[PDB]
Design an enzyme around this catalytic site. Structure first.
Site, PDB file in Angstrom:
ATOM      1  N   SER A  61       0.766  -1.233   0.000  1.00  0.00           N
ATOM      2  CA  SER A  61       0.000   0.000   0.000  1.00  0.00           C
ATOM      3  C   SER A  61       0.808   1.301   0.000  1.00  0.00           C
ATOM      4  CB  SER A  61      -0.976  -0.005   1.157  1.00  0.00           C
ATOM      5  OG  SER A  61      -2.111  -0.711   0.725  1.00  0.00           O
ATOM      6  N   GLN A 117     -11.209  -4.664  -0.740  1.00  0.00           N
ATOM      7  CA  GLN A 117     -10.703  -5.443  -1.851  1.00  0.00           C
ATOM      8  C   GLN A 117     -11.662  -5.428  -3.021  1.00  0.00           C
ATOM      9  OE1 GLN A 117      -7.792  -6.319  -1.858  1.00  0.00           O
ATOM     10  NE2 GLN A 117      -7.081  -7.500  -0.074  1.00  0.00           N
ATOM     11  N   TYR A 147     -10.990   2.537   4.590  1.00  0.00           N
ATOM     12  CA  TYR A 147      -9.772   2.319   3.819  1.00  0.00           C
ATOM     13  C   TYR A 147      -9.985   1.269   2.742  1.00  0.00           C
ATOM     14  CZ  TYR A 147      -4.872   1.093   2.944  1.00  0.00           C
ATOM     15  OH  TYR A 147      -3.635   0.811   2.436  1.00  0.00           O
ATOM     16  N   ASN A 149      -8.797  -0.367  -1.360  1.00  0.00           N
ATOM     17  CA  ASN A 149      -8.081  -0.373  -2.627  1.00  0.00           C
ATOM     18  C   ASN A 149      -9.018   0.026  -3.756  1.00  0.00           C
ATOM     19  OD1 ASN A 149      -5.837  -1.316  -1.317  1.00  0.00           O
ATOM     20  ND2 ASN A 149      -6.326  -3.460  -1.700  1.00  0.00           N
ATOM     21  N   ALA A 315       1.580  -3.492   2.649  1.00  0.00           N
ATOM     22  CA  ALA A 315       1.692  -4.938   2.734  1.00  0.00           C
ATOM     23  C   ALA A 315       1.132  -5.681   1.539  1.00  0.00           C
ATOM     24  CB  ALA A 315       0.994  -5.439   3.989  1.00  0.00           C
TER      25      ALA A 315
END
Ligand SMILES: *[B]([O])([O])[C][N]C(=O)/C(=N\OC([C])([C])C([O])=O)C1=[C]SC([N])=N1
Length: 358
Positions: A61, A117, A147, A149, A315
């Protein structure tokens, strides 16, 4: 390599590697604008390859910092605006839940609940359109931070559209090259494979697998030398010659929202220095970092505050990274490991080290 730095680094990192059983690791301490490197263990256990200053690690990230800055650069160039609705760059998004969702929202995880995700089943560009069209917000835009992606990744993909360049090409031309990050890649070229460390997950060697929005949200690999240089750039954006790049960096450190005592930027996350170590340490735990939380809009956004502890955890399945710096002190640190160990332990090590240096 002043003995002072040398000593804190080893007093801190040594017990860390042994406690977390980290195979390999590289650390860069930027003290007074100068970098200092340390390396431990293996990049490849099988082939007995040691970690060196040329070893490439998956940043995970931390890649979001590059995305935030590239996006900031786009704003600075006048190509996009954070106030622009998402649909302006993706007119195909016609589902009514997108009304009111701006690029600011995607960029800062406040669109209203976009998942962390992107589903595995999402491959094609139409598979992605379908996903976003069908996605249902759990909250009104600009009210909650989750948070994800799928949120900042979309931002990155849309941000470069007006440029007409592909995300990788844009990143290279506008960020990597100007800053001379010549061993930083979204795709590791065959020539560099020999420096690509293997990540480790429960004893098994692994590298990141292709996935939707991977480049934009967690796909950059880099060496300790380039990351040190990346920190130097975010510490002093004014030394940067390219006008729009300099602005972008500053824009990534502006404070758009606040949750707890943390402020969200573009990729980077910030807290006022001095900070309470317990606050960044416990706060870095996924228990909190990935939790949905109410956010207070900062109207208008506060420009980058020099007295800030600016950072980002990163990570992948086999890697764990961390970057943190204090502009006002010209102080920073980069921690790269080919093992995804707990965020709290990362921040705690970075804290002891940096606190010891002022
Ligand atoms: B960033 O590193 O904060 C986002 N990280 C990820 O998307 C990945 N893993 O994070 C979770 C799933 C929370 C974890 O298990 O730590 C990730 C990207 S590619 C890969 N194999 N894992």
């Amino acid at each position: 390599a002043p003995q002072q730095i040398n000593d804190i680094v080893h007093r801190t990192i040594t017990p860390l590697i042994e406690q977390q059983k980290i195979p390999g690791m590289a650390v860069a301490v930027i003290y007074q604008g100068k970098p200092y490197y340390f390396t431990w263990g293996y990049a490849d256990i099988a082939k007995k390859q040691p970690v060196t200053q040329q070893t490439l690690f998956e940043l995970g990230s931390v890649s979001k910092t590059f995305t935030g800055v590239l996006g900031g650069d786009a704003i600075a160039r006048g190509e996009i605006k954070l106030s622009d609705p998402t649909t302006k760059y993706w007119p195909e998004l016609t589902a009514k839940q997108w009304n009111g969702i701006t690029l600011l929202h995607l960029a800062t995880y406040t669109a209203g609940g976009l998942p962390l995700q992107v589903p595995d089943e999402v491959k094609s560009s139409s598979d992605l359109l379908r996903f976003y069209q069908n996605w249902q917000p759990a909250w009104a835009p600009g009210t909650q931070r989750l948070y994800a992606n799928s949120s900042i990744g979309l931002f990155g993909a849309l941000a470069v559209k007006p440029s007409g360049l592909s995300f990788e090409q844009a990143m290279q031309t506008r960020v990597f090259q100007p800053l001379k990050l010549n061993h930083t890649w979204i795709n590791v070229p065959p020539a560099e494979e020999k420096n690509y460390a293997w990540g480790y997950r429960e004893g098994k060697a692994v590298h990141v697998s292709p996935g939707a929005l991977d480049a934009e949200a967690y796909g950059v690999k880099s060496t300790i030398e380039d990351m040190a240089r990346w920190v130097q750039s975010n510490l002093k954006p004014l030394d940067i010659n390219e006008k729009t790049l300099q602005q972008g960096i500053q824009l990534a450190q502006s404070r758009y929202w606040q949750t707890g005592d943390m402020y969200q930027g573009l990729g980077w996350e910030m807290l006022d220095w001095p900070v309470n170590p317990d606050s960044i340490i416990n706060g870095s735990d996924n228990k909190i970092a990935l939790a949905a939380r109410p956010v207070k809009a900062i109207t208008p956004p506060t420009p980058a505050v020099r007295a800030s502890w600016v950072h980002k955890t990163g990570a992948t399945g086999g890697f764990g990274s961390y970057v943190a710096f204090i502009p006002e002190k010209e102080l920073g640190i980069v921690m790269l490991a080919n093992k995804n160990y707990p965020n709290p332990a990362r921040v705690d090590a970075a804290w002891q080290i940096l606190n010891a240096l002022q």
